[PDB]
Amino acid sequence: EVYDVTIIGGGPIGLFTAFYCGMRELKTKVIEFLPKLGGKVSLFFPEKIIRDIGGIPGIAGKQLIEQLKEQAATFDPDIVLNQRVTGFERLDDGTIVLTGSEGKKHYTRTVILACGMGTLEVNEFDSEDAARYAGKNLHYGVEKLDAFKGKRVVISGGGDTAVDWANELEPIAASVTVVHRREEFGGMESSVTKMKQSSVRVLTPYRLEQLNGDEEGIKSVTVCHTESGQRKDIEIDELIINHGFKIDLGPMMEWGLEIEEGRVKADRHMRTNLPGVFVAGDAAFYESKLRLIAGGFTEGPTAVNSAKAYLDPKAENMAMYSTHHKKLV
Numbered sequence: 001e002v003y004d005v006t007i008i009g010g011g012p013i014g015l016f017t018a019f020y021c022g023m024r025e026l027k028t029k030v031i032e033f034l035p036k037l038g039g040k041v042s043l044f045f046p047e048k049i050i051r052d053i054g055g056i057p058g059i060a061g062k063q064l065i066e067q068l069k070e071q072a073a074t075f076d077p078d079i080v081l082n083q084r085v086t087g088f089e090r091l092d093d094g095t096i097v098l099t100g101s102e103g104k105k106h107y108t109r110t111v112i113l114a115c116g117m118g119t120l121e122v123n124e125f126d127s128e129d130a131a132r133y134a135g136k137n138l139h140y141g142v143e144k145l146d147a148f149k150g151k152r153v154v155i156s157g158g159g160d161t162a163v164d165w166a167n168e169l170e171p172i173a174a175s176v177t178v179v180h181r182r183e184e185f186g187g188m189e190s191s192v193t194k195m196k197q198s199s200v201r202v203l204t205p206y207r208l209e210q211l212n213g214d215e216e217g218i219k220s221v222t223v224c225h226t227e228s229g230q231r232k233d234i235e236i237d238e239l240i241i242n243h244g245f246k247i248d249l250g251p252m253m254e255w256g257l258e259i260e261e262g263r264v265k266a267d268r269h270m271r272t273n274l275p276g277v278f279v280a281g282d283a284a285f286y287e288s289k290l291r292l293i294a295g296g297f298t299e300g301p302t303a304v305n306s307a308k309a310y311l312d313p314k315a316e317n318m319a320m321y322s323t324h325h326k327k328l329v
Protein backbone atom coordinates (compact mmCIF):
# COMPACT_ATOMS: atom_id res chain seq x y z
CA GLU A 1 0.00 0.00 0.00
CA VAL A 2 1.59 3.23 -1.23
CA TYR A 3 1.40 6.37 0.89
CA ASP A 4 1.74 9.85 -0.57
CA VAL A 5 3.82 10.95 2.42
CA THR A 6 5.60 9.07 5.19
CA ILE A 7 6.92 11.22 8.00
CA ILE A 8 9.89 9.86 9.99
CA GLY A 9 9.58 11.13 13.57
CA GLY A 10 6.49 11.59 15.77
CA GLY A 11 7.85 14.46 17.81
CA PRO A 12 6.03 17.78 17.93
CA ILE A 13 7.12 18.66 14.37
CA GLY A 14 6.11 15.31 12.89
CA LEU A 15 2.70 15.66 14.50
CA PHE A 16 1.93 19.11 13.08
CA THR A 17 3.41 18.01 9.75
CA ALA A 18 0.97 15.10 9.64
CA PHE A 19 -1.94 17.45 10.23
CA TYR A 20 -0.86 19.70 7.38
CA CYS A 21 -0.55 16.64 5.08
CA GLY A 22 -4.21 15.94 5.91
CA MET A 23 -5.18 19.49 4.98
CA ARG A 24 -3.60 18.92 1.56
CA GLU A 25 -5.44 15.61 1.12
CA LEU A 26 -2.28 13.46 1.20
CA LYS A 27 -2.41 9.82 2.27
CA THR A 28 -0.21 10.01 5.32
CA LYS A 29 1.89 7.85 7.67
CA VAL A 30 4.03 8.77 10.69
CA ILE A 31 6.72 6.37 11.90
CA GLU A 32 8.20 6.84 15.39
CA PHE A 33 10.97 4.94 17.22
CA LEU A 34 9.63 5.51 20.76
CA PRO A 35 6.49 3.82 22.16
CA LYS A 36 4.81 7.21 22.39
CA LEU A 37 4.55 10.43 20.47
CA GLY A 38 5.99 13.83 21.40
CA GLY A 39 9.72 13.38 21.01
CA LYS A 40 11.99 15.55 23.16
CA VAL A 41 9.05 17.36 24.68
CA SER A 42 7.51 14.16 26.01
CA LEU A 43 10.80 12.63 27.18
CA PHE A 44 12.70 15.61 28.45
CA PHE A 45 10.38 18.46 29.46
CA PRO A 46 6.79 17.30 29.71
CA GLU A 47 6.25 19.23 32.92
CA LYS A 48 7.95 22.49 31.91
CA ILE A 49 6.01 25.57 30.74
CA ILE A 50 6.87 26.47 27.15
CA ARG A 51 6.45 30.17 26.44
CA ASP A 52 8.11 30.67 23.02
CA ILE A 53 5.47 29.08 20.78
CA GLY A 54 3.69 31.72 18.67
CA GLY A 55 0.23 32.49 20.08
CA ILE A 56 0.50 30.39 23.24
CA PRO A 57 1.35 32.40 26.36
CA GLY A 58 2.28 29.31 28.42
CA ILE A 59 1.78 25.57 27.97
CA ALA A 60 3.16 22.49 29.72
CA GLY A 61 5.15 20.21 27.43
CA LYS A 62 2.76 17.37 27.91
CA GLN A 63 -0.26 19.53 27.18
CA LEU A 64 1.36 20.76 23.95
CA ILE A 65 1.81 17.16 22.91
CA GLU A 66 -1.88 16.39 23.65
CA GLN A 67 -2.88 19.42 21.57
CA LEU A 68 -0.53 18.36 18.73
CA LYS A 69 -1.94 14.80 18.83
CA GLU A 70 -5.37 16.27 18.47
CA GLN A 71 -4.17 18.20 15.40
CA ALA A 72 -2.47 15.13 13.91
CA ALA A 73 -5.64 13.08 14.48
CA THR A 74 -7.86 15.42 12.46
CA PHE A 75 -7.50 13.57 9.12
CA ASP A 76 -6.77 10.14 10.60
CA PRO A 77 -3.20 9.44 9.35
CA ASP A 78 -1.66 6.02 10.16
CA ILE A 79 0.66 6.13 13.18
CA VAL A 80 3.43 3.57 13.47
CA LEU A 81 5.23 3.24 16.80
CA ASN A 82 8.22 1.30 18.11
CA GLN A 83 10.11 1.32 14.78
CA ARG A 84 13.46 2.78 13.78
CA VAL A 85 13.54 3.50 10.05
CA THR A 86 17.01 2.48 8.93
CA GLY A 87 16.76 1.44 5.24
CA PHE A 88 16.00 3.46 2.08
CA GLU A 89 15.68 2.42 -1.57
CA ARG A 90 13.85 3.36 -4.78
CA LEU A 91 11.72 1.09 -6.93
CA ASP A 92 11.73 1.27 -10.71
CA ASP A 93 8.64 3.48 -10.77
CA GLY A 94 10.10 5.98 -8.32
CA THR A 95 8.31 4.63 -5.24
CA ILE A 96 10.44 4.86 -2.10
CA VAL A 97 10.73 1.87 0.21
CA LEU A 98 11.55 2.50 3.84
CA THR A 99 12.78 -0.39 5.92
CA GLY A 100 12.39 -0.61 9.65
CA SER A 101 15.33 -2.21 11.44
CA GLU A 102 13.12 -5.31 11.90
CA GLY A 103 12.56 -5.84 8.18
CA LYS A 104 9.27 -3.94 8.04
CA LYS A 105 8.57 -2.50 4.53
CA HIS A 106 6.86 0.86 4.16
CA TYR A 107 5.82 2.17 0.68
CA THR A 108 5.71 5.88 -0.06
CA ARG A 109 5.84 8.49 -2.83
CA THR A 110 7.61 11.00 -0.56
CA VAL A 111 9.45 11.18 2.73
CA ILE A 112 9.52 13.96 5.30
CA LEU A 113 12.35 13.62 7.78
CA ALA A 114 11.05 14.93 11.13
CA CYS A 115 13.60 12.83 13.02
CA GLY A 116 15.40 15.57 14.98
CA MET A 117 19.07 14.76 15.53
CA GLY A 118 18.30 11.07 15.70
CA THR A 119 16.46 8.44 17.71
CA LEU A 120 16.08 9.44 21.32
CA GLU A 121 18.08 6.79 23.13
CA VAL A 122 19.64 6.72 26.57
CA ASN A 123 22.53 4.23 26.83
CA GLU A 124 21.44 1.06 28.68
CA PHE A 125 18.07 2.36 29.65
CA ASP A 126 14.69 1.33 28.29
CA SER A 127 12.74 3.72 26.04
CA GLU A 128 9.54 2.48 27.73
CA ASP A 129 10.90 3.65 31.06
CA ALA A 130 12.09 6.95 29.67
CA ALA A 131 8.55 7.48 28.27
CA ARG A 132 6.65 6.18 31.30
CA TYR A 133 8.48 8.14 34.04
CA ALA A 134 9.24 11.39 32.18
CA GLY A 135 8.49 14.46 34.37
CA LYS A 136 8.14 12.32 37.54
CA ASN A 137 11.02 11.30 39.83
CA LEU A 138 13.25 10.31 36.86
CA HIS A 139 16.08 12.79 36.12
CA TYR A 140 19.03 12.93 33.70
CA GLY A 141 20.86 15.38 35.93
CA VAL A 142 20.78 17.64 38.96
CA GLU A 143 18.93 20.90 38.31
CA LYS A 144 18.94 22.20 41.90
CA LEU A 145 20.36 20.31 44.87
CA ASP A 146 17.63 21.53 47.24
CA ALA A 147 14.81 19.54 45.63
CA PHE A 148 16.73 16.37 46.69
CA LYS A 149 16.81 17.37 50.38
CA GLY A 150 15.66 14.44 52.55
CA LYS A 151 15.09 12.14 49.56
CA ARG A 152 16.41 8.63 48.94
CA VAL A 153 18.39 9.06 45.75
CA VAL A 154 19.82 6.55 43.36
CA ILE A 155 22.28 7.62 40.68
CA SER A 156 23.02 5.11 37.91
CA GLY A 157 26.27 5.90 36.12
CA GLY A 158 30.03 5.67 36.60
CA GLY A 159 31.37 8.86 35.03
CA ASP A 160 32.74 12.01 36.68
CA THR A 161 29.40 13.83 36.67
CA ALA A 162 27.88 10.80 38.43
CA VAL A 163 30.62 10.71 41.12
CA ASP A 164 30.51 14.50 41.59
CA TRP A 165 26.69 14.44 41.79
CA ALA A 166 26.92 11.82 44.52
CA ASN A 167 29.43 13.91 46.51
CA GLU A 168 27.41 17.13 46.50
CA LEU A 169 24.21 15.17 47.18
CA GLU A 170 25.57 13.23 50.18
CA PRO A 171 25.24 16.17 52.66
CA ILE A 172 21.68 16.97 51.51
CA ALA A 173 19.89 13.70 50.65
CA ALA A 174 18.40 11.24 53.16
CA SER A 175 20.68 8.75 51.34
CA VAL A 176 22.68 8.42 48.17
CA THR A 177 23.27 5.18 46.33
CA VAL A 178 25.43 4.87 43.23
CA VAL A 179 24.88 1.97 40.92
CA HIS A 180 27.55 1.18 38.37
CA ARG A 181 28.41 -1.94 36.33
CA ARG A 182 32.18 -1.66 36.75
CA GLU A 183 34.25 -1.37 39.91
CA GLU A 184 36.24 1.46 38.26
CA PHE A 185 34.93 5.05 38.02
CA GLY A 186 35.62 8.17 35.90
CA GLY A 187 36.85 11.62 37.01
CA MET A 188 39.73 12.33 39.40
CA GLU A 189 40.33 9.47 41.81
CA SER A 190 40.13 11.72 44.89
CA SER A 191 36.42 12.22 44.09
CA VAL A 192 35.91 8.45 43.87
CA THR A 193 37.85 7.69 47.09
CA LYS A 194 35.78 10.42 48.82
CA MET A 195 32.44 9.01 47.56
CA LYS A 196 33.61 5.50 48.44
CA GLN A 197 34.52 6.47 52.03
CA SER A 198 31.49 8.74 52.58
CA SER A 199 28.05 7.47 53.57
CA VAL A 200 27.27 7.19 49.84
CA ARG A 201 26.33 3.60 49.13
CA VAL A 202 28.40 2.30 46.26
CA LEU A 203 26.89 -0.65 44.43
CA THR A 204 29.41 -2.19 42.02
CA PRO A 205 29.57 -4.13 39.83
CA TYR A 206 25.80 -3.90 39.33
CA ARG A 207 23.62 -3.58 36.26
CA LEU A 208 20.39 -1.60 36.33
CA GLU A 209 17.79 -4.13 35.27
CA GLN A 210 14.35 -2.75 35.90
CA LEU A 211 12.28 0.05 37.27
CA ASN A 212 9.41 -0.72 39.64
CA GLY A 213 6.74 1.89 40.06
CA ASP A 214 3.14 3.02 39.96
CA GLU A 215 1.21 6.03 38.59
CA GLU A 216 2.85 8.43 41.04
CA GLY A 217 6.46 7.35 40.21
CA ILE A 218 9.40 4.89 40.47
CA LYS A 219 9.52 3.17 43.88
CA SER A 220 12.53 0.80 43.48
CA VAL A 221 15.00 -0.38 40.89
CA THR A 222 16.04 -3.94 40.49
CA VAL A 223 19.74 -4.33 39.92
CA CYS A 224 21.77 -7.48 39.23
CA HIS A 225 25.37 -8.21 40.36
CA THR A 226 27.27 -8.59 37.04
CA GLU A 227 29.11 -11.72 38.36
CA SER A 228 27.09 -13.57 40.96
CA GLY A 229 23.84 -12.77 39.11
CA GLN A 230 22.19 -11.88 42.41
CA ARG A 231 19.28 -9.51 42.30
CA LYS A 232 18.69 -6.63 44.65
CA ASP A 233 15.77 -4.28 44.83
CA ILE A 234 16.93 -0.83 45.84
CA GLU A 235 14.45 1.72 47.27
CA ILE A 236 13.87 4.93 45.19
CA ASP A 237 12.56 8.44 46.00
CA GLU A 238 14.53 9.96 43.13
CA LEU A 239 16.30 8.22 40.24
CA ILE A 240 19.05 10.03 38.33
CA ILE A 241 20.17 8.34 35.14
CA ASN A 242 23.64 9.44 33.96
CA HIS A 243 24.40 6.83 31.28
CA GLY A 244 24.80 9.35 28.45
CA PHE A 245 22.65 9.81 25.38
CA LYS A 246 22.82 8.03 22.10
CA ILE A 247 21.22 10.58 19.76
CA ASP A 248 22.43 10.30 16.19
CA LEU A 249 21.24 9.63 12.67
CA GLY A 250 22.56 6.05 12.61
CA PRO A 251 22.05 4.18 9.34
CA MET A 252 20.53 7.28 7.65
CA MET A 253 24.20 8.14 7.52
CA GLU A 254 24.43 5.70 4.59
CA TRP A 255 21.51 6.99 2.56
CA GLY A 256 23.75 9.55 0.83
CA LEU A 257 22.06 12.52 2.49
CA GLU A 258 23.95 15.76 2.58
CA ILE A 259 24.56 16.11 6.32
CA GLU A 260 26.11 18.97 8.28
CA GLU A 261 26.69 19.10 12.06
CA GLY A 262 24.59 15.96 12.56
CA ARG A 263 21.63 17.51 10.76
CA VAL A 264 20.21 17.31 7.27
CA LYS A 265 20.88 20.11 4.85
CA ALA A 266 17.70 21.82 3.69
CA ASP A 267 17.12 24.31 0.89
CA ARG A 268 14.41 26.96 1.34
CA HIS A 269 11.81 24.46 0.08
CA MET A 270 12.97 22.03 2.79
CA ARG A 271 14.34 19.71 0.12
CA THR A 272 17.25 17.40 0.86
CA ASN A 273 19.53 16.25 -1.97
CA LEU A 274 17.47 13.03 -2.31
CA PRO A 275 14.55 13.43 -4.71
CA GLY A 276 11.25 13.01 -2.89
CA VAL A 277 12.95 13.45 0.49
CA PHE A 278 12.17 16.56 2.56
CA VAL A 279 13.01 17.59 6.12
CA ALA A 280 11.52 19.64 9.00
CA GLY A 281 12.09 20.34 12.71
CA ASP A 282 15.39 19.90 14.56
CA ALA A 283 16.63 17.57 11.76
CA ALA A 284 16.88 20.51 9.31
CA PHE A 285 20.18 22.32 8.84
CA TYR A 286 20.55 25.79 7.33
CA GLU A 287 22.31 28.89 8.55
CA SER A 288 19.54 30.96 10.11
CA LYS A 289 17.46 27.97 11.25
CA LEU A 290 15.34 28.46 14.33
CA ARG A 291 16.05 25.45 16.50
CA LEU A 292 12.70 25.76 18.28
CA ILE A 293 9.30 24.19 18.04
CA ALA A 294 8.13 27.42 16.33
CA GLY A 295 10.75 26.81 13.61
CA GLY A 296 9.52 23.30 12.98
CA PHE A 297 5.92 24.52 12.74
CA THR A 298 6.90 26.50 9.59
CA GLU A 299 9.28 23.92 8.12
CA GLY A 300 6.73 21.11 8.39
CA PRO A 301 4.07 22.69 6.17
CA THR A 302 6.82 23.97 3.82
CA ALA A 303 7.99 20.40 3.47
CA VAL A 304 4.42 19.24 2.78
CA ASN A 305 3.93 21.89 0.10
CA SER A 306 7.14 20.79 -1.65
CA ALA A 307 6.12 17.14 -1.37
CA LYS A 308 2.77 18.05 -2.95
CA ALA A 309 4.46 20.07 -5.75
CA TYR A 310 6.75 17.11 -6.39
CA LEU A 311 3.74 14.78 -6.75
CA ASP A 312 1.71 17.30 -8.79
CA PRO A 313 3.39 20.45 -10.24
CA LYS A 314 -0.05 22.00 -10.90
CA ALA A 315 -1.10 21.89 -7.25
CA GLU A 316 -1.78 25.14 -5.41
CA ASN A 317 1.32 26.51 -3.59
CA MET A 318 -0.17 25.90 -0.14
CA ALA A 319 -3.30 24.60 1.52
CA MET A 320 -6.41 26.77 1.89
CA TYR A 321 -6.54 28.91 5.06
CA SER A 322 -8.00 26.86 7.92
CA THR A 323 -10.75 29.49 8.36
CA HIS A 324 -12.02 28.75 4.81
CA HIS A 325 -10.84 25.16 4.48
CA LYS A 326 -13.78 23.05 3.19
CA LYS A 327 -13.00 20.03 5.43
CA LEU A 328 -12.65 22.17 8.62
CA VAL A 329 -15.64 24.62 8.67
Ligand SMILES: Cc1cc2nc3c(=O)[nH]c(=O)nc-3n(C[C@H](O)[C@H](O)[C@H](O)COP(=O)(O)OP(=O)(O)OC[C@H]3O[C@@H](n4cnc5c(N)ncnc54)[C@H](O)[C@@H]3O)c2cc1C
Pocket residue numbers: 008009010011012013014031032033034038039040041044045049050051052053083084085086114115116117118119120280281282283291292293294296
Ligand atom coordinates in the same frame (compact mmCIF):
# COMPACT_ATOMS: atom_id res chain seq x y z
C1 LIG B 1 15.53 20.52 28.08
C2 LIG B 1 14.95 21.05 26.77
C3 LIG B 1 14.13 22.18 26.80
C4 LIG B 1 13.58 22.71 25.63
N1 LIG B 1 12.78 23.80 25.70
C5 LIG B 1 12.25 24.33 24.55
C6 LIG B 1 11.38 25.52 24.53
O1 LIG B 1 11.10 26.13 25.60
N2 LIG B 1 10.90 25.94 23.34
C7 LIG B 1 11.16 25.35 22.18
O2 LIG B 1 10.67 25.82 21.14
N3 LIG B 1 11.98 24.27 22.12
C8 LIG B 1 12.53 23.74 23.23
N4 LIG B 1 13.34 22.61 23.14
C9 LIG B 1 13.60 22.07 21.80
C10 LIG B 1 12.52 21.13 21.36
O3 LIG B 1 12.59 19.99 22.18
C11 LIG B 1 12.79 20.73 19.92
O4 LIG B 1 12.86 21.93 19.14
C12 LIG B 1 11.71 19.83 19.39
O5 LIG B 1 11.65 18.62 20.18
C13 LIG B 1 11.95 19.47 17.94
O6 LIG B 1 10.91 18.59 17.55
P1 LIG B 1 11.14 17.56 16.39
O7 LIG B 1 9.84 16.81 16.22
O8 LIG B 1 11.77 18.23 15.20
O9 LIG B 1 12.33 16.62 17.00
P2 LIG B 1 12.28 15.62 18.29
O10 LIG B 1 11.44 16.17 19.38
O11 LIG B 1 13.75 15.31 18.53
O12 LIG B 1 11.49 14.34 17.80
C14 LIG B 1 12.02 13.56 16.79
C15 LIG B 1 11.52 12.15 16.96
O13 LIG B 1 11.99 11.35 15.88
C16 LIG B 1 12.23 10.04 16.37
N5 LIG B 1 13.08 9.38 15.39
C17 LIG B 1 14.30 9.83 15.06
N6 LIG B 1 14.86 9.05 14.11
C18 LIG B 1 13.95 8.11 13.82
C19 LIG B 1 13.94 7.02 12.86
N7 LIG B 1 15.06 6.85 12.14
N8 LIG B 1 12.87 6.22 12.82
C20 LIG B 1 11.79 6.47 13.61
N9 LIG B 1 11.72 7.50 14.49
C21 LIG B 1 12.77 8.33 14.65
C22 LIG B 1 12.89 10.32 17.70
O14 LIG B 1 12.86 9.19 18.57
C23 LIG B 1 12.06 11.47 18.21
O15 LIG B 1 10.97 11.01 19.00
C24 LIG B 1 13.91 22.07 24.32
C25 LIG B 1 14.74 20.94 24.30
C26 LIG B 1 15.27 20.42 25.48
C27 LIG B 1 16.15 19.20 25.42
